[model samples]
Target chain A: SASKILSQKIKVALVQLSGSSPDKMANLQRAATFIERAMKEQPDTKLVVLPECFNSPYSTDQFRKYSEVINPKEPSTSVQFLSNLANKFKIILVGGTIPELDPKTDKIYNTSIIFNEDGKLIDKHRKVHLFHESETLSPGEKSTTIDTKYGKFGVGICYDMRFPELAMLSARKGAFAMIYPSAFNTVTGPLHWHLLARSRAVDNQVYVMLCSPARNLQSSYHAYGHSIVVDPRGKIVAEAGEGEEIIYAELDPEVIESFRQAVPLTKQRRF
Target chain B: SASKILSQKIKVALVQLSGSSPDKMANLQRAATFIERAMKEQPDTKLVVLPECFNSPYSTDQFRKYSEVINPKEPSTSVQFLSNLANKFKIILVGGTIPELDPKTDKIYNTSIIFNEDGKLIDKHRKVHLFHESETLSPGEKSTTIDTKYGKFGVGICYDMRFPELAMLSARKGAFAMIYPSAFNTVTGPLHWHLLARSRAVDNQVYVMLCSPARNLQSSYHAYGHSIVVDPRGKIVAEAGEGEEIIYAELDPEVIESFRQAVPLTKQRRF
Candidate 1:
């Protein structure tokens, strides 16, 4: 089943949005504007990815201060804000990593919610791997792969990007695209971002989409700006600059199968 | 932790042994002889891997006739024999997959028992990804990884080799080496064997050593000879040709870490 499915191609756009500090509403306004720009500008983009906590300021204080939880059925004003944009633009939205209230735990969860073009909430994946062990943030226990007409994709938040188990599990479940909405600190960003993306690509033989916040060197939770698209061979097919920008590209699924067929990576596992 | 540990290289060898019919004692004796010869020829070899069912014939009749149980205090004959050889030669032994009587169910469970150089049973891994669809062979429940002085090497068996998740789980668990001892059919061997080895190595950013049975075309199953070793970058380092011979190779653990560090693949994880 998986062998036959590897021949399709997927094209995506990574949007690096500029964030305004201490103002959640303004940040949302700018994000909506950027999404509009990304959709209109990149016509070939079937999917568009935004940065981590792009809806709010990338601050733990702001996370503690202005995080909101949207009901899956009836999301609050902020959730409606994103869905409306998705419906209007007729594009899939990977909302990046957003601060949200966990209805069950009351503790905050850094969540990544995906919306299909029809405006239906297709998938919502909580950050399984959390950053800052000291926080009340909880790690998501579930690993999911969302199947679509375009292709199968997986979603994770910032720190979760460091753990390969989720990605591997998702791949086993049949994911052609893995979307990571991360706001990595400049420290880890420069060191691990590109390296991890390429390795995951090479290991799984799948497309890896990493969308990061516009690098803010001044912020305590400094964001890494370089958004990247890594192919199954661990090559950087596309990447964004340090400041706010958008990058778009298409992936041929046949190539994934070709790479795997020629290489046969998923076979000799002794682990 | 794994990144730094893998910086220290370790020599690895996968031993693919042919399975005889009906008589397990005969098979075990022959396997022991092959292992000893490998050790003698390759003096610098630190770790030795054996094929699945090396101690017993892999046919249905053999499984029913020769399946044995190994334990903490009292081990089965295969375990005892391999342990002695490991101690005598002062080398690590990857016992490969065997038919063992499970303590809980009494049913035969596919198992991997590992021994350190000093004759100590460092770890015993029960195969998780088992084969049942192809044959009447029983499957295993859980998977495991062993940390050795050489480096953390993840062990998987024949059918378990087909699943990528098993390998990735071990890679994430911090194994620098992925070793699987197998007796594969010609259909799957030529098409899948090498590709699988390279995938596990490059994707997980670790070395993959697959010891497959030599040209055992002597049987209907037709085990392909070509016991092979592939590096982290998916290059063939050494291989056993189409014959029953003791093949040897050295794996530098540092190469794995250097590849991962140079690439920083662990960090680029996505859904």
Candidate 2:
């Protein structure tokens, strides 16, 4: 019997947020509004993605001020906010990335957290690679691939997308998609953002989803806000311009399996 | 003095050959006509590239009969033909790929040979990664990159470009560009050929050149005839349609230096 690897088709939303700020609460509230709106607008959406550093201003100087501890049991402010939001919507929330403050060593990390529909914390993956050690931040040593009822997903932050090894490893482990919560600026965005996303998808025979913050002229770093989703065939299925919006796409198991059969690169790959 | 790595700007031509057939002599004659035409059309072009399987029908079954040994001294028919062409034009010729027969083992390998302006055999790279053991082809264990008067160059054949590690390693070694003589079919060509080329350029901040055979309707493998040139910034500097044509582009040193400074990916890579 011909078997399908992607459990089933699921609609997903990439929320491109605009109102990121110095105040962590304000940014968290803004993300909440967008997540609710995305679900109401498209009620069938099972997966929700937010941009990198969505709940904090994307700056080196302010990283310590906006950082949160990873304690979902008692829950930090941002963690509680995201956990509630995911439970309220009954969806899997890829909560973008936050500045993680380690109490033991006083080292800070750029981290991404995932929440299941029951408001349970499933996984936390620190950004494996940092851009410029920009925030005097430490990089994560291990890569993360999450197993969920919907499908297997790989999470990486911003600069991690440039490294093919992270995506390739996930795909080799039967990941359906590599979702990146990235904040690539205007300078390098036009040059590499879309090109890299499509390349990873085509090379791995998997879907690629990237969520980015909306372009803010006032901010120190002007993000190039073109959140996009590429299918297994390297075609742009959904995209958003440089603004606050929700882009949706249906990831089909049939599409992944059919294209894999034709190309057979998943099986053909040699070291 | 701050010396530039790219040495000097030079125009390159990718020749997408037509009328390729089983008649080896006739195919050589057809390639010669195209080469002469390309030089006349773009007189400044210092580097001329030919498509994979340019001098023979691109069929797996024909590999044994069409094979040659690289010996410009005694000279096989193909080696003498390419040597004369390079010397006659006084230009660097990236003589596509050929089926090679080893005398000692009688094992056949898919190989690409390069000739300098003096018609000297500068470098030869056997295809590092074979598409299928289906063609009874033995994979080459060595990778090739060479220093020339033009600049440092890296070479791969057909499916070899699919491995990012090959290009990344070459870039790390200060290669200015990666040239691939490929014969991607209509199916995977439209999907990945351009994406992979541009991806390699963007990540490594180097030029990527691909030469492909003109679409052959009668051949078993229908070549996707879009020979392309991607700059360091991942822009399509030059491209050919799905037909027999010669495309030209000038690789600039200043462009590579200025762009690398702005993005600084070459310096910022952590992993």
CA lDDT of each candidate? 0.72, 0.85
Best by TM-score: 2
Q: Estimate each model's TM-score.
A: 0.58, 0.90
Complex DockQ per candidate: 0.08, 0.41
What is the DockQ score, from 0 to 1, of model 2?
Answer: 0.41
Q: Per-residue alpha-carbon lDDT of model 1 for A123-209, expressed as tens digits?
A: 888777553542756667677577677668888776665666777777767778678887766666765677667656766778899
Please identify model 1 stretches exceeding 4 Å from their true place: A1-10, A103-105, A131-134, A264-271, B1-271
- Lowest summed lDDT across 10 adjacent residues in model 2 chain B is found at B262-271
Worst lDDT run of 10 residues, candidate 1 chain B, spans: B262-271
lDDT of 1 at B4: 55
CA RMSD of each candidate after superposition: 8.8, 3.1
For model 2 chain A, the run of ten residues with the poorest summed lDDT: A262-271
Q: Which residue runs of candidate 2 sit more than 4 Å off their true CA positions? A: A1-5, A68-73, A131-136, A218-220, A266-271, B1-5, B40-44, B68-73, B131-133, B217-221, B265-271
Q: For every candidate, what share of the true interface contacts is present?
A: 0.08, 0.39
